[PDB]
Amino acid sequence: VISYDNYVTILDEETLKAWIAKLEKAPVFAFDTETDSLDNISANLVGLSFAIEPGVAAYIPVAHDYLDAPDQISRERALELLKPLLEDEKALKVGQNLKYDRGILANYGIELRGIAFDTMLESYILNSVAGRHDMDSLAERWLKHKTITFEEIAGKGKNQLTFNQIALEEAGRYAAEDADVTLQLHLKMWPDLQKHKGPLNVFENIEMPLVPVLSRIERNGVKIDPKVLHNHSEELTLRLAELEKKAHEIADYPLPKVILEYRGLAKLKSTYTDKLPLMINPKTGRVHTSYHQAVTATGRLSSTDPNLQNIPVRNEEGRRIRQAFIAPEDYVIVSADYSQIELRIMAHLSRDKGLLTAFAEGKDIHRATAAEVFGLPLETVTSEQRRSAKAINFGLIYGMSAFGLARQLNIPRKEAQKYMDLYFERYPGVLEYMERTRAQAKEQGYVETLDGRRLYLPDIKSSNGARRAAAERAAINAPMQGTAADIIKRAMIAVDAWLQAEQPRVRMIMQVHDELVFEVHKDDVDAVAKQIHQLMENCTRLDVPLLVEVGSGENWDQAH
């Protein structure tokens, strides 16, 4: 198994200072913190752990307060002895989800600085679809080691203990093991990551620098007006009653209108209006959402608990929800959005002068696409044509299988195929891309984004598992969706740097789809929007035609 003889529990300063001296001379060391809560901003540091070499790790208990708990170094003294080491940028650390730990230390005024390696992101950048990227999974995969699970020392259910209640030595085995395993995994994954400058550029210059900015995004939280949300819940209660009554009176077709409307509001009320006001943190009075950094196959950040991505972008009731995200007094919400980013990326990936020109001369791409495909002057393109072209363009982004146009644009048959081929006859660059990408997906087994991030398609060569074609679709969509992700991430890191260095009255409060949202002082908006705009357009990829439309207002809906 593993127990009390492997790792040392440090209960005295002299031993702690000895360990700090060896940490000071270690090239990299593993670091971990243990707390009494998963809520980063209300969690309390219960103990910390380090590892300097495979198998040599210690646990420093600073706040186990169970009955007759053995005396331990006080939290304040342990932190002042450890503070200069922790805050030293040249002292490199390895950790598993260093986003959590950086936050825990920020609760005590400490800025973690050697955030050099996170084993969750090492794993993720190696092959995002390999499996779960959590420590216990990795230990089995890369080290064939079965780790002590948290519920093995704490329990399960309502009567699960909190870390400070666990005995010192049981706590120590778990925490020192965490430190140790993280270091071992680092040693087995880092030389592999070095093998390919693609994945190494993305881990080093995109994944890793973002760990402290996601921590800053999450701890800032978003300010929400729950009154608004309560009124909205009351109204939806009444509207669902009325809509039910409308369909009962009824027993281009009225009944298959009110039912749909019912379903839509019904869901929205529960998924947002009833839950969002119950997600306010009592210490900050804000809602702090969880950005998951190593979950999507494409490298896009996904958020949960307030999954901001699922609130209805174009819906009147969706707008209503976006009005509850409020800017504090004398500040305004600013929204910096990247315009049709995957369609601009596809313009460069397809290397097509037609698409590249539309964007270059400021044209609405859907009208230009419709003008060129249908062969009509740009000023007389009707809304039905703009809409048909839009259906081709967003289909291309999702690699959507030709009849897909006939289901989105739920009306033609091979007339849609006529549209598809006509498009390629005017925009040939789009199929040279699709042929090329499918090809390397089958040749290499993976596709790449512009910065080197890779998506492994292990079914591109599936012996005709029919929907094996989904990997070909994924083959053409991943380069576009992943380059969008990388660009957003480079923008986040570039903007956070400026905010950290110049310290203006602004804070980055959320990231959703291709948008970065901020709170900024009403008197500072004009310059802050100018710099946000310039940083997002010029400090990312300069080969893709980028456009950031910036907005501001007293709530998110006005900003958007």
Distance CA 255, CA 36 (A): 53
The closest of 428, 432, 420, 423 to 371, measured between CA atoms, is 423
User: Is 86 within 8 Å of 109 (Cβ atoms)?
Assistant: no
Beta strands in 91-236 (DSSP E): 92-95, 115-118
Distance CA 269, CA 259 (A): 15
The closest of 537, 398, 543, 365 to 477, measured between CA atoms, is 398
The closest of 509, 482, 554, 513 to 313, measured between CA atoms, is 513
Distance CA 98, CA 96 (A): 6
Options 3.40.47.10, 1.20.120.1200, 3.30.2130.10, 1.20.1060.10; CATH for 220-290 is 1.20.1060.10
User: Is 533 within 8 Å of 546 (Cβ atoms)?
Assistant: no
Question: 555 forms bridges with which residues in the sheet?
Answer: 326
Distance CA 335, CA 554 (A): 11
Using DSSP's 3-state secondary structure scheme, residue 118 falls into strand
Looking at the domain covering 291-340+485-559, what would its CATH class be? alpha beta
Delimit the CATH 3.30.420.10 region(s) of the chain: 1-219
User: Is 457 within 8 Å of 440 (Cβ atoms)?
Assistant: no
Distance CA 507, CA 503 (A): 9
The single residue listed with the structure tokens 């980028």 is 546
Over the range 471-481, which residues count as b (16 or more CB within 10 Å of their CB) and which as e? Answer: bbbbbbbbbbb
Report strand pairing: 8-9 vs 56-61. Answer: parallel
The distance in angstroms from the start CA to the end CA of the chain is 55
Delimit the CATH 1.20.1060.10 region(s) of the chain: 220-290
Using DSSP's 3-state secondary structure scheme, residue 55 falls into coil
What are 75's two structure tokens? 């939290």
Using DSSP's 3-state secondary structure scheme, residue 555 falls into strand
User: Is 407 within 8 Å of 417 (Cβ atoms)?
Assistant: no
User: Is 460 within 8 Å of 445 (Cβ atoms)?
Assistant: yes
* Amino acid occupying residue 495: V
User: Is 556 within 8 Å of 517 (Cβ atoms)?
Assistant: yes
User: Is 181 within 8 Å of 223 (Cβ atoms)?
Assistant: no
Using DSSP's 3-state secondary structure scheme, residue 382 falls into coil
What are 50's two structure tokens? 């380090």
Resolution as reported, in Å: 3.9
Options 3.40.50.12780, 1.10.150.20, 3.30.450.20, 2.60.120.1270; CATH for 341-484 is 1.10.150.20
H/E segment holding residue 47 = strand 45-53
Delimit the CATH 3.30.70.370 region(s) of the chain: 291-340+485-559
Using DSSP's 3-state secondary structure scheme, residue 352 falls into coil
Name the CATH superfamily housing domain 1-219: Ribonuclease H-like superfamily/Ribonuclease H (3.30.420.10)
Q: Where are the alpha helices (DSSP H) in 250-382?
A: 255-268, 316-322, 341-349, 353-360, 365-374
Q: How many CA atoms lie within 13 A of 178 on its CB side?
A: 25
Length of the chain (residues)? 560
The closest of 479, 164, 470, 463 to 342, measured between CA atoms, is 479
Report strand pairing: 8-9 vs 28-35. Answer: unpaired
Question: CA-CA distances (angstroms) from residue 496 to 33, 229, 321, 490?
Answer: 25, 31, 27, 10
The closest of 534, 532, 528, 538 to 511, measured between CA atoms, is 532
Distance CA 142, CA 124 (A): 13
Q: What's the farthest any 2 CA atoms get from each other in the chain?
A: 85
The closest of 513, 541, 518, 490 to 340, measured between CA atoms, is 513
The closest of 422, 420, 434 to 351, measured between CA atoms, is 434
DSSP state letters, 411-462? S-SHHHHHHHHHHHHH-HHHHHHHHHHHHHHHHHSEEE-TTS-EEE-TTTT-
Q: At what angle do helices 383-397 and 365-374 cross, to 10 degrees?
A: 100
Delimit the CATH 1.10.150.20 region(s) of the chain: 341-484
User: Is 416 within 8 Å of 396 (Cβ atoms)?
Assistant: no
Q: At what angle do helices 341-349 and 383-397 cross, to 10 degrees?
A: 70
